[PDB]
Symmetry: D2
Subunit: 200 residues, 4 copies
C-alpha cells in the first residue's frame, strides 16, 4: 500500500470539533490527520513491520527531531506485538539527526528500521541510506509517517507508509514549523497567519 491516501480535495476537520491547545488557535487552518487516525494506521503499520522483519533482531533507527513521536508509538505497537505472541523480534533503539549531514558500526550486519516523519523530495532519505549503507547493514527498510505527492520527488519509495498527502504544509505530531507545533498531537495545516507569526 502507498499508505492511507489523502486526496487533494480532502476537507479535513474543523478545529472547533477537537481539543486543541489555546495558543495555536489562529495559527492552524484545519485538522488534517486526527491523532487517533495516526494511532490506528500506526497499529497496522507495526503489524506490517513485524510480518516483514521479525524475522530477526532489529535496530530501530529514529530520525530526530520530527521522527521521535512516530518512532515512539510505532515501537510501542511493535512491543505490544512482541508480548502477545511467540513472534518476538528483539530490538535495540538508535537516534540520528540530519541537518544534510549526520549529528554507527552498530548497524553492521544488522536489520535496520529507519523511522522518519515525512519524505518530501526524498533527498534527506537518500542521504540517510547512503550514509547507513556505508556501515554494511544486513537489510535496510524505511518507515515514514507521511509521503508527499510532489513533482520535486526523485521517487524513492519507503517500505512502510502511514499516509500519502498533498504538498500542503502540515504540522503537529512532532512535525514542526520553525520548532513550533511539535507540542500538538493531531497533524494539522498551518494558517497563513501561523506561517507569518512563527517565521524564522
Amino acid at each position: 500500500s502507498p499508505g492511507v491516501v489523502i486526496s487533494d480535495d480532502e476537507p479535513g476537520y474543523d478545529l472547533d470539533l477537537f481539543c486543541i491547545p489555546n495558543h495555536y488557535a489562529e495559527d492552524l487552518e484545519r485538522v488534517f490527520i486526527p491523532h487517533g487516525l495516526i494511532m490506528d494506521r500506526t497499529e497496522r503499520l507495526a503489524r506490517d513491520v513485524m510480518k516483514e522483519m521479525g524475522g530477526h533482531h532489529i535496530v530501530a533507527l529514529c530520525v530526530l527531531k520530527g521522527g521521535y513521536k512516530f518512532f515512539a508509538d510505532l515501537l510501542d505497537y511493535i512491543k505490544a506485538l512482541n508480548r502477545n505472541s511467540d513472534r518476538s523480534i528483539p530490538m535495540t533503539v538508535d537516534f540520528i539527526r540530519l541537518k544534510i549531514k549526520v549529528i554507527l558500526s552498530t548497524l553492521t550486519g544488522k536489520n535496520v528500521l529507519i523511522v522518519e516523519d515525512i519524505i518530501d523530495t526524498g533527498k534527506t532519505m537518500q542521504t540517510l541510506l547512503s550514509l547507513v549503507r556505508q556501515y554494511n547493514p544486513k537489510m535496510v527498510k524505511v518507515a515514514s509517517l507521511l509521503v508527499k505527492r510532489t513533482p520535486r520527488s526523485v521517487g524513492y519509495k519507503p517500505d512502510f507508509v502511514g499516509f500519502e498527502i498533498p504538498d500542503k504544509f502540515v504540522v503537529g505530531y512532532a512535525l514542526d514549523y520553525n520548532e513550533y507545533f511539535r507540542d500538538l498531537n493531531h497533524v494539522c495545516v498551518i494558517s497563513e497567519t501561523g506561517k507569518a507569526k512563527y517565521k524564522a
Copy 2:
C-alpha cells in the same frame, strides 16, 4: 454544534490499511469512522460536556447496550479532566435498557449517553420518563446522529458525528448482536449482512 459531519459520499477507508478482527474480514465493506477519530472527538465532547454540566453532581446514564463503549470512553475522558483541575465535581453512574430506581436522578444533572440516534423515538421515550424524576438538568450525548427523513426531529445536546442513512456497526453498535467487538465504526457488507441475518 452538529458535530463531525460525514457526507453521503464519504468512502470511508480501505480495510487493509487497518487492524481488523480476522473473523470480520469478509463481513465489512469499509472502515467508516476510525476508532482513533472516535477518541479524538470524544475527548473534545467530554470537555464540552464539562462546560455545561460541571458545577453540579452529574449522574451519567449509559443506554445499553450500544451506548456502553461511548459511555466508558466518554467518562474516562471526563474523569481525566476531573482529576487534573483545581476543583472537580462528584459523578455517579447508572444503566438503562429500552426494550420494544431513578429517584437517584432527582436534583442532579443527568447526562444520558447513547450510541446512535435515528428516528429519535427511543430517546424521546427515555426523556419523557427521566424528566418525571425532577432532575436539575438533562442533556443527551450521542456518538452518532443519522440524517434521516424518518427522524421525528429530536436533536441531542452533544453529537460526535453526523452520518448518512447507512447501516453502520462497530464500537458497540450491533447487527443482530454482532460487531459489538470491533472498535472502528464500519459499514457492513452484503456478504456479511446476510450471514448474520436473523
Copy 3:
C-alpha cells in the same frame, strides 16, 4: 491465583498520583493504581483467549461495579483479535443483581462472567447457577478482585488481584454509589465512610 496483594501492603500516598479533587479528603491511600490494573488485565485477556479462544465467547458484564473491568478486558481481548494469530467472535450482555434478557443466547457457547469483586461469593453462586440454567458449553469466571475473606465454593477462573479484607473503592467499585468515577482502586478513609454513609 492473581496478583497477591499482601495484608500489610501500605499502598501509595495520594499526593503522588492524580486524584479527583472532590475525593481528596475521602481516600486514605491508593491501593491499586489504575495502570497496574490495566497491565494485569492485558495479561488476563491473553489468558481468556488461551482458555476460550477457540469458540464463540459471550462476555457477561455484572453491573454496576464490573463495567470498567469489562470494558477494559474486552478492549484488551479486542486488541488480541486483530493483532494475533487467534480471533474469537464475541457478543456481550449485561446483568445487574435482571439484567438482560435474553439469556437463552448462551446455550452451547463459551460464557465469561466478568465481575468486579468476589467477597462472600453469593453474587457469583447466583450468576454461575443462572448461566448453567441455559446449558452453556463452558462457563468461566473473571473477577478483578478476590478478597481473602472467610466466605464457600467456586474458585474464580481469572483473577486480577487478590486482596485483604479491606474496604476498597474506585475503578467502578463504590461505597454508596460514590467512588465509581475514580480510576485507581483506593482505600476509603474514615472521613470518607462518614461523609457518604447511608
Copy 4:
C-alpha cells in the same frame, strides 16, 4: 521537591507470570519491579507538578538520550493533554542530547527548560549536563528523572521531579538498558543472573 514514589530496599516486585512480557526476555528477567502502568499513573501526576512550576513561560523540553526517550514521550504526552484541556496554555518546544555531548541548544535561551532523564545514580551525568545547559542562559532549569537511585555513591545531586526512588539494584525496561538490551520493554524490571551474565560488556 518531593522524593516521588519511595520503593523500599526489600520491595519484592511482581512475578513475571502475572504480566505480558516479551518472549525473548522471559528468562533474562527476575521480577517486574515497576509496572508500566504504575509508571504511567506516576507520570500523569509529575506532568501536573511540572506545569504548576514551569507553566508560566515557554517550556523547552530537553530529552536525555537514549534511556530517557520513553519517559520523555509519555511525560510530554501528559503535559500536552493538560495544555489542550485548558484555556490557559503555554507553547512547548523540544530538543535532544546524549552524553562527551552529542547533539543548536540556543533554543534553550530565555526559556523554561525541563530536562528529562531516565535515572540518576551517582549524579555525575546530570551535573555534567547542567554545566552545559546553564551556559545557554535559560530562564530557569528544572530536572525530572523517572528514577533516582539510593546509593552511598550519590554525589549529592537531586532533581526537581522524581518518578520513583529505587533501591541500589540494576533495573532495566522502559528504555533503561543493559548493554543496549531491554530498551524494548514496557515495565521496569530486574535482570536475572542469566540475563546479566548474558549481556555483560
